[PDB]
RNA sequence: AGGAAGAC
RNA sequence: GGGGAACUUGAGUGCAGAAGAGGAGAGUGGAAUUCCACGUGUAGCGGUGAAAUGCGUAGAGAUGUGGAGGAACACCAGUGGCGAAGGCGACUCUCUGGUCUGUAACUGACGCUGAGGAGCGAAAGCGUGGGGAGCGAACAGGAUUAGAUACCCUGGUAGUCCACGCCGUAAACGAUGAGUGCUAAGUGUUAGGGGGUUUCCGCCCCUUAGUGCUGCAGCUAACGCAUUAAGCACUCCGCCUG
C-alpha cells in the first residue's frame, strides 16, 4: 500500500525535494483516474464515485492548462510521456 | 447478448438472434459425432403420429456424456460449442487420461478451467457430485432419477434445480416448475445451472426461420370440416360450439389434468 | 454521568469481552441508552458494533 | 397435573384465556364470547374477570394448582385477570410480558382516518 | 490482520475435533496466508438455539493475509456440514 | 384521540 | 490591459492523525406476519360508534413443535452523522468517492462563476424476465346516509422487492443561488489540535470545521433574520413586471 505513489513522485520528480509541481500532481492523478477508470468499469451504476473521477479529471485539465500557459516545452514533454490526449 | 436486426426488409422487421459470443470454435469432434435423419413425426408402421413436425435443416448428433462415471481424473475444458440438438450448449473436456468427452456447458464456466467428477469433489461449477455429497441449497443441474442411468431432470438452457435439503435414504429437490420430489441420494447430479441461459429472449422473426428447425405449419381447428376436428364446421367463424374446448381427437384440452391417477411414482412427489 | 472508558482510560472495546458486554446490556437484551449509561459518543457507536457482533456470533441473546 | 401456563390474550377488543400444560397440552379455554357478550362488554376487564374465573373452574376441574401467566397483546383486563387467577384459589409464581414484538417485519396497516 | 472466529457443533469426537481443525488451518495456509495465532475456548453454552444444539466450540484464528485465505476459508466453512459459525474481522 | 349529519 | 522577474496568504500536493446510515457487489443473522403438516383442545374468532359481511363441528381462534418463502431491519437513536441534491440506519468482507484537524516540506495565482452541453435525480408510471409474505389503487360484498361511486369493516388484482433500460417530475423547502471578506455576546452538541501540579480520573483557557437555541447595532411593510444574515460590500448566474 502506497508505493506506486513513492515511485511515480522520485520518478517524476525534478527539482531534489518537490512534492507540489504540477508535474508530479498530474502524474498522480493520471494513475488515479486510470485506477478509479478500471474501478468504474466492473461497477458500472456506481454513480458517486463517477462524481468523483469527474472532479479529479476538471483538477487535472485545469492543472493542464496553467502548465501550458507557463511553459510548453514542459507541457509538451510531459504529454508525450504520459501519453495522453 | 442478443443481437436485434435493424428492419431492412418486412421479414427481419421483428427479429432477433443471439450473438454466439461463448461459442468458440465451429468444428466438433470427429470421434464424438453420430448420424441423425429426420423422422417426421413418422412411426415404425409409418403413420404420422406426432402433428406439426419435419422438414428442418439437418443435423449430427454429438453424443454427450450424461452419466459422469470418470471418478478420480481431472479434466480440462478444452471448448465451448454449438449443438443444434438443445436449446444449451455443449463443452469439450480432455480428461487427463487422454480422452474427449462432451458435457454440458454451465453458467459461467470459461476455457481451460478445471473439471473434477468424483463423490470426494468440491463444489465448483461443472463438477459432478451423488446428491448425499452436495450441501444444501446448491443450484444443481443434470439429476438422475435412478443411480447410473444418466442425468434426466433438468437439462434444457438457462434451467437449474435446487436442493431442499437431505433426508436419508432421500433427498429433496425443487426442480423446475417450482416442484418438489424425492430423489434417492446415490444419484450422481451435476452443479451448477446451465449456461446458455438466453434463448427465451429471442424473437424468430420470419416463418421460415421457425420452419429451418423443422416445425410445420398449425392450422386450428375452429377452420378445419366437423369430421376433422371436434371444432370444425359452423357457418362462418365459428366460436368454440361445444362446452369443454377438445383435442383434435376426443379429449378436452383446458384444464383437464391429464396424469394417470394410480401413479406408481405418487409416493415420492410432495408438492406440485 | 461518568463514562467507564474514559475513566479508566482504556483503548478500543476488544471485543471479545463478554463480561463486560454483559455488563452495558440490559436483562431482557436491549443495549442500554446513552442517557442511562453514561458513556460519550463515539465509545456508543463502537460499544454497539461490538454489541451487534457478540448478536450475530451467539455470545450475548437477542430475546429473554 | 399439578402445574401449567396461563394464556392470557387481551385485545382492544376481546379477552381468550387458555389455561396449558408446561408442555404445550391445552385444558380449556373461554372468553367474553364464550360468556355470551357480544358487544363493547368483551373489552372491559370485568368480563375478563369472569373469563378467568371459569378457566380457573376448569383448571382445578382436570386438577393443577400452581400456575405461571403469559399476557399477549395491549388491553384491559390485566389485573383484574390475574387476581381473578390468584384468587380463585390457585397459585401464580410468574407474569410474563409476552407480547410479539417485530423489529420491523412487514409494514403494518393503513391509519383509521384517511 | 484478520481475527475469525468459527464454532464447530459439540457432536464431534475430539479425534476428528482436531482433524477438522488441522483442516481448516490448512485452509488458510495453503494460500500464502500464514496464521499469527491461535486460541482455544473450548465448549460453551450458546446465548440462543442454532439447529440442536445448545453449547459448542470456539476457536479463534489469527492470520495476516492478502485476502484471498479470508473468503476462500468462508466458502469453504459455510459449505461445510460440520462448523456451526464463523465471522472474520478486519482489525484496524 | 372520545358518533354520519346538507342548503339559505 | 499585453510582457519579464520576485513573494505566500487564495488554491492544490506531500507527511502525521480522526470520524462517518457516502456508494456498488457478494455473503450471513434474529424477532415478527402469512402459508403447510402434526399434537392438545372446544364453539366461537374477527370487527366497529352500535353493527354486519367474512372464517369456523369438513374442528376455527388459542396453544407446542417442524418446514417454506418474501419484505423490513426494534432498543442502539440523539433538533446526532455522512452526502452536491435526491437520499443513506441489522452484521461481515472486496473495491471506491469524498470531508475535517495539525504541519510549513513543497509548486507559486494554478482561482470564482457558468448561458448552451453532459451526468445524477424521491414516489408514481412504462418495456422484458423473475419473485410475490405483508400492505394495497382498481374491483366486489357489509354498513351508515335522503343518495354515499367516500370515510368505517371483510376480502383483493396491478404495484411496492431484484436485474437491465426508459420518463425526468414534487410543497425536489431553509418556500432563502454560488463564492470571498468584515460586524456585540451567551449556551448546548459532533470530530479534532495546543497550554496550565499527571502518562491517573476531571477542571479551566484558546482553537478550528460542522450542527442547534436565545439575543445588539443593522435590515424589514410586519412576522421575523441576526457570524449557519434576510446586515455592510464585490463578482458571476437564474428569474419577475396586475
Redesign the pocket.
Same mark, same amino acid.
Given at each position: 500500500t502506497?508505493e506506486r505513489?513513492?515511485q511515480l513522485?522520485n520518478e517524476f520528480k525534478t527539482?531534489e525535494?518537490?512534492?507540489?509541481?504540477?508535474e508530479?500532481?498530474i502524474a498522480?492523478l493520471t494513475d488515479?483516474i486510470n485506477?478509479?477508470n478500471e474501478?468504474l468499469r466492473?461497477?458500472?451504476?456506481?454513480?458517486?464515485?463517477?462524481?468523483?473521477?469527474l472532479?479529479?479529471v476538471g483538477?487535472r485539465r485545469?492543472?493542464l492548462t496553467?502548465l501550458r500557459?507557463?511553459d510548453v516545452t514542459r507541457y509538451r514533454e510531459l504529454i508525450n510521456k504520459l501519453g495522453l490526449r | 447478448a442478443i443481437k436485434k436486426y435493424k428492419p431492412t426488409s418486412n421479414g427481419r422487421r421483428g427479429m432477433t438472434t443471439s450473438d454466439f459470443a461463448e461459442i468458440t470454435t465451429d468444428k466438433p469432434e470427429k470421434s464424438l459425432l453420430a448420424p441423425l435423419h429426420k423422422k417426421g413425426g413418422r412411426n415404425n408402421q409409418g403413420k404420422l403420429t406426432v402433428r406439426h413436425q419435419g422438414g428442418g435443416h439437418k443435423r449430427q448428433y454429438r453424443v454427450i456424456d450424461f452419466k459422469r462415471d470418470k471418478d478420480g481424473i481431472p479434466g480440462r475444458v478444452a471448448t465451448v460449442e454449438y449443438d443444434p440438438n438443445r436449446s444449451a450448449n455443449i463443452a469439450l473436456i480432455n480428461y487427463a487420461d487422454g480422452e474427449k468427452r462432451y458435457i454440458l456447458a454451465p453458467k459461467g464456466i470459461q476455457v481451460g478451467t478445471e473439471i473434477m467428477s468424483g463423490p470426494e469433489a468440491d463444489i465448483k461449477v461443472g463438477n459432478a457430485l451423488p446428491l448425499i455429497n452436495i450441501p444444501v441449497g446448491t443450484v444443481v443441474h443434470n439429476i438422475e432419477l435412478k443411480p447410473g442411468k444418466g442425468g434426466q431432470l433438468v437439462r434444457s438452457a438457462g434451467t437449474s434445480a435446487?436442493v431442499?435439503?437431505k433426508e436419508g435414504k432421500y433427498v429433496l429437490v425443487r426442480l423446475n416448475s417450482?416442484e418438489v420430489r424425492m430423489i434417492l441420494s446415490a444419484c450422481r447430479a451435476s452443479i451448477g445451472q446451465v449456461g446458455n441461459e438466453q434463448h427465451?429472449?429471442i424473437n424468430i422473426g420470419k416463418a421460415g426461420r421457425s420452419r429451418w428447425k423443422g416445425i410445420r405449419p398449425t392450422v386450428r381447428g375452429s377452420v378445419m370440416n366437423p369430421n376433422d376436428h371436434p371444432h370444425g364446421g359452423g357457418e362462418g367463424r365459428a366460436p368454440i360450439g361445444r362446452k369443454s374446448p377438445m383435442s383434435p381427437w376426443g379429449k378436452p384440452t383446458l384444464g383437464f389434468k391429464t396424469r394417470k391417477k394410480k401413479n406408481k411414482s405418487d409416493k415420492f412427489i410432495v408438492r406440485r | 454521568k461518568?463514562?467507564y472508558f474514559?475513566?479508566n482510560?482504556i483503548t478500543h472495546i476488544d471485543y471479545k469481552d463478554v463480561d463486560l458486554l454483559k455488563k452495558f446490556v440490559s436483562e431482557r437484551?436491549?443495549?442500554?441508552?446513552?442517557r442511562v449509561t453514561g458513556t460519550?459518543?463515539?465509545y456508543?457507536?463502537?460499544?454497539?458494533?461490538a454489541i451487534?457482533?457478540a448478536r450475530?456470533m451467539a455470545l450475548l441473546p437477542?430475546?429473554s | 397435573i399439578e402445574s401449567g401456563?396461563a394464556?392470557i390474550?387481551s %385485545?382492544?377488543?376481546?379477552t381468550?384465556v387458555?389455561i %396449558?400444560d408446561t408442555?404445550?397440552?391445552?385444558? !380449556?379455554?373461554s !372468553?367474553?364470547?364464550?360468556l355470551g357478550f357480544?358487544? !363493547?362488554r368483551?373489552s372491559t376487564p370485568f368480563a375478563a374477570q369472569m373469563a378467568a374465573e371459569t378457566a380457573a373452574k376448569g383448571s382445578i376441574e382436570h386438577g393443577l394448582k400452581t400456575l405461571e401467566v403469559?399476557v399477549?397483546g395491549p388491553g384491559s383486563g390485566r389485573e383484574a385477570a390475574i387476581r381473578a387467577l390468584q384468587a380463585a384459589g390457585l397459585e401464580v409464581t410468574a407474569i410474563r410480558d409476552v407480547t +410479539?414484538? +417485530?423489529?420491523?417485519?412487514?409494514?403494518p +396497516?393503513? *391509519? *383509521? *382516518?384517511? | 490482520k484478520y481475527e475469525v472466529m468459527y464454532i464447530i457443533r459439540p457432536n464431534i469426537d475430539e479425534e476428528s475435533k482436531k482433524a477438522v481443525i488441522e483442516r481448516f488451518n490448512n485452509v488458510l495456509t495453503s494460500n500464502g496466508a500464514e496464521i499469527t495465532g491461535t486460541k482455544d475456548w473450548g465448549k460453551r453454552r450458546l446465548a440462543?438455539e442454532?439447529?440442536d444444539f445448545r453449547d459448542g466450540f470456539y476457536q479463534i484464528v489469527n492470520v495476516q493475509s492478502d485476502?484471498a485465505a479470508?473468503?476462500e476459508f468462508?466458502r469453504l466453512a459455510?459449505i461445510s456440514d460440520d462448523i456451526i459459525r464463523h465471522?472474520?474481522?478486519?482489525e484496524e
Open positions: 502506497q505513489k513513492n513522485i527539482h525535494s518537490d512534492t507540489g509541481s504540477p508530479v500532481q498522480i488515479s485506477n478509479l474501478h466492473t461497477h458500472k451504476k456506481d454513480h458517486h464515485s463517477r462524481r468523483g473521477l472532479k479529479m483538477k485545469n492543472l496553467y500557459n507557463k | 435446487q431442499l435439503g417450482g427465451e429472449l | 461518568v463514562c474514559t475513566s482510560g437484551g436491549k443495549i442500554l441508552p446513552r460519550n459518543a463515539k456508543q457507536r463502537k460499544l454497539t458494533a451487534k457482533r450475530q437477542y430475546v | 401456563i394464556h390474550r %385485545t382492544f377488543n376481546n381468550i387458555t %396449558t408442555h404445550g397440552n391445552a385444558i !380449556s379455554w !372468553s367474553a364470547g364464550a357480544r358487544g !363493547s368483551k403469559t399477549k +410479539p414484538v +417485530p423489529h420491523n417485519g412487514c409494514r +396497516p393503513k *391509519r *383509521r *382516518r384517511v | 440462543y442454532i439447529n485476502a479470508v473468503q468462508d459455510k465471522i472474520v474481522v478486519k
